[PDB]
From Swiss-Prot, chains A, B:
Binding site for Cu cation 2: 62, 104, 508
Binding site for Cu cation 1: 60, 448
Record protein name field: L-ascorbate oxidase
Intrachain disulfide bonds: 19-201, 81-538, 180-193
GO cellular-component term (any): extracellular region
Enzyme class name: oxidoreductase
Residue sites binding Cu cation 3 per the record: 106, 450, 506
Keyword Cell inner membrane: no
Organism, scientific name: Cucurbita pepo var. melopepo
PANTHER family: FI03373P-RELATED (PTHR11709:SF394), MULTI-COPPER OXIDASE (PTHR11709)
Amino acid sequence: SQIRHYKWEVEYMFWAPNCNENIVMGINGQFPGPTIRANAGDSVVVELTNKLHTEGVVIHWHGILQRGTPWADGTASISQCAINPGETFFYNFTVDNPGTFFYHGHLGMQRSAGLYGSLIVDPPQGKKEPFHYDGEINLLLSDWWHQSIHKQEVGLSSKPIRWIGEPQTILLNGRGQFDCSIAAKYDSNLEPCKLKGSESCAPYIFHVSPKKTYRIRIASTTALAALNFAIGNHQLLVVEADGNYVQPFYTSDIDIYSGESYSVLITTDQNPSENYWVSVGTRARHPNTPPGLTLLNYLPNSVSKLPTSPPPQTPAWDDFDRSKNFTYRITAAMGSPKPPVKFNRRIFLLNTQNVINGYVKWAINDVSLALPPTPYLGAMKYNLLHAFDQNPPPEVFPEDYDIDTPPTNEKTRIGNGVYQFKIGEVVDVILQNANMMKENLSETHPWHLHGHDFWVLGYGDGKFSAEEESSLNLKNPPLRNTVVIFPYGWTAIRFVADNPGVWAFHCHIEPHLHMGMGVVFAEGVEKVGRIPTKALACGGTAKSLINNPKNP
Amino acid sequence: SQIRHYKWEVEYMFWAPNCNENIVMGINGQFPGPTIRANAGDSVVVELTNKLHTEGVVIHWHGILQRGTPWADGTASISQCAINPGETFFYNFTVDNPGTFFYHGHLGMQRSAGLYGSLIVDPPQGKKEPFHYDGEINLLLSDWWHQSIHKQEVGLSSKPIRWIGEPQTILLNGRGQFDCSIAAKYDSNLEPCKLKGSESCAPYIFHVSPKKTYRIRIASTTALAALNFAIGNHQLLVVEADGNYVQPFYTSDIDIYSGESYSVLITTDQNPSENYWVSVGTRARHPNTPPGLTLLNYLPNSVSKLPTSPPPQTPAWDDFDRSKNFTYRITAAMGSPKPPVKFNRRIFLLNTQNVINGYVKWAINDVSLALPPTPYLGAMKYNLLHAFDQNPPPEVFPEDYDIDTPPTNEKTRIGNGVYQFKIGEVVDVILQNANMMKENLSETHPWHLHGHDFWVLGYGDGKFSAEEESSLNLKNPPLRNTVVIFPYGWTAIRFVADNPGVWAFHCHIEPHLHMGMGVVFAEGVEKVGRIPTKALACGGTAKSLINNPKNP
Ligand SMILES: *[C@@H]1O[C@H](CO)[C@@H](O)[C@H](O)[C@H]1NC(C)=O
Ligand SMILES: *[C@@H]1O[C@H](CO)[C@@H](O)[C@H](O)[C@H]1NC(C)=O
Ligand SMILES: [Cu+2]
Ligand SMILES: [Cu+2]
Ligand SMILES: [Cu+2]
Ligand SMILES: [Cu+2]
Ligand SMILES: [Cu+2]
Ligand SMILES: [Cu+2]
Ligand SMILES: [Cu+2]
Ligand SMILES: [Cu+2]
Ligand SMILES: [Cu+2]
Ligand SMILES: [O-]
Ligand SMILES: [O-]
């Protein structure tokens, strides 16, 4: 047990991720943010000073359960009011279990502006990891556009919508290249980068010694891109996923969607006289972004010594069978917690893309989420019944819905009610994907649950029917916090409503979140303790806690 | 027979083909240029005045045979010295046969700048076409870049080479739209163009009346793209290819490579209350350019009445079996001239991408063409034996060459010798494609012969061998002036060397010709008559012919 204290300021600054200058949101003058590293069971105290000028900020600690501390989850209008310019707020929370986690902006579209970094929790003090490696490498993946976040925000709030488009650069630990390639050698149509190694966009090189084994920790905070990770001539052994251990298996490359984290081990077996390419390319959408590239540099080979091969070609973006083939393998490591065999609640959530009042919105069982100005945790503790809609949101959709047709948008509305759970319910969620407004298009959506991990019971094609029950894996299902629904399919997850608080469950692609694609879960709120005053200080909660009468 | 006289001035001007201003090369203030139309048997006289400030100009008339007028072909350094600023040149030639032709700049990269237009030839007066139609719709296809042609020229001549990239826009009759789509209603990701229809980039709408039949004449002067043409809900019957009638067949779309012209017939037999999409999309290279679109407007429907369907989705760019399936189906119309059955000369031309002295160049049996300052025709007529290389260029490549693997570049040279034929020779040219510099890459190349039409005897995969001799079509082969080689395959054509003059045979993709991909054929020059002085007044021809002694 130890307290790790971080003194942090967030400020916009000029920076050039791909050697083209723009503004980035840096923490203590650096981009990406600093790494937090602690051992399981420690308490992390972060005092954040907001040094932005007109904007409020919040930081969300992705994958941390916020057990006892629902108020530090870092979701504006759900766990807290956002931190005002010039104010300091303390995020104090216990890191319970080891893993590869990260943190990112959770207000507006501030994470796409660069607010994110690594949070790595080692085993309890004195304990060892269940596997052996001699070194580790940390990789955080993100994506980068050249337009302003605030021009992109106004574009997605406009009628007609101005879609943000495919990213200009895929960043690997904050660096990437635009309009040139470090692997130009293999193709005369590519431009060589004129980089010395010193630049803001020069690639983070992976230095390794031959005949050793390493843990490569990989996390994604992309706003949109689903990426594919591969190392030339090196097979990967998947050992951890979303802070939990999986039954190990070998693969030549992994798919990683936004909100996921993996640990993969590699052994430097291959010929020690050469360097090998690390390639991270786009999958799941039709690519119009070059691959993020770097070198697995076998010491003492010169880093200017190119590999003999081109980078590994990324698998075809639309080979979803290949995607499923990897996704469906992941199973819990033996010794993990097995699900409750019987559920107490099952909810069906239909994911549609709609047009509400001329605005292209995303909707879950026809409600497109719009968050209130009063934080739900505050509202529910103080029992302010006028702060949001108290009607229960829709828990099932019409079984006569044709998931292969565009929506009609007849009854689609905007709303902000909450699904409430009784503290201890075993909840089941089947996420159903469908056709979007464009004929014959259904996309992949990564869904992430705050303040909990869930067991991934299964995935299927088409519409979920009750007869699907015997395929659900109750024996070995992995424990995760992020999961994908594939085109035209469903996914079924199970968790226990055991953590007092108001938690978000939303699609982790930042534009879809900005357009309403998420729901809010709240359970055991009468068990929440005292919330920090700064978290209560706005909306309905400020109005009703500030004693300010009249005549007095 | 009439004499059709044109009086034209070539000059640059600001123009916005896609509503983005740039400079374009216009004729008499027009972009594209004026249509020439004549009847077979007429003489065309074009007096062209050069009003570019510093640059020479020539205009090549694609598909006209220049029988008796070889000096009028418009190929700088082959038929003539270019026309200097402020000078006027007379191109006087006959049109022998009916067909869809066009004209384009043939000095440096002037045609990519906009120097092109149509040249159509009707049947002899009194005679009629073998097929009936009520209307005619004419369409010239090109592609457009937003970068300067003089920066593209320099970039292609630099070490490292700077590839011109995929075009920004496809131009249908000089017009196209960039960064928005006139079909944006079917996909919220697309930006709607705001166009009242009066703009320079506003679509050229095809107006048709119901229950009528129309001949749609389509020609391509693209610098780089291979395009696929389709109209929503309508069948296309192919009746003419390169000024020659083909045996008719119905197809749902046609593929068209740079240098080809087709005439298709359609019938307006569909639901008369709606309009339909015309889509010209990129194939044979990974697309990065949006499709060219316009409407088949069934009168009296308002042209702003959009179609119920989206535009026909383009065939997958790399399905070369679908491409070959269209291409192989083309045969001469019943009654056409059949080939001489025995040949007198057979030449094998291997097509490779090479690196000669740091520069990426294209080579034909390892000679990358560099054209001399003396025009070959004048040079050969006056027997100027030092103006270019008198050593006969290779008519065969080595049988130990592996076309599946990159060149070694060991012997690759730049050259300018000429292949010579005796007037009356039947020549067969076997075009062999091979792997490029990148591993596992071979592209399509359209090849075009000047001053002759040829029979396309056949195509095949891999390297041509004596086993393939029996597959050559000698019954029904089509007469064309442009033919394609597919990835790693061969194409065999046969023609008779019966036209006195010096003729270019080259790939019609403008960068490839700029990089050396062409050969020069000469036949019967002893029988060429008087060459206009402007065509002789440069290089070694002006040297020998201008009598300016010294001491005399
Ligand atoms: C957070 O921890 C710091 C350091 O122990 C303490 O000063 C601060 O008051 C704590 N705030 C809350 C809300 O726990
Ligand atoms: C071309 O035609 C014009 C007009 O008839 C004539 O004056 C000129 O001399 C001709 N030149 C040649 C080379 O035929
Ligand atoms: Cu989270
Ligand atoms: Cu997250
Ligand atoms: Cu989503
Ligand atoms: Cu979230
Ligand atoms: Cu041509
Ligand atoms: Cu030509
Ligand atoms: Cu593509
Ligand atoms: Cu070519
Ligand atoms: Cu030519
Ligand atoms: O989370
Ligand atoms: O020609």
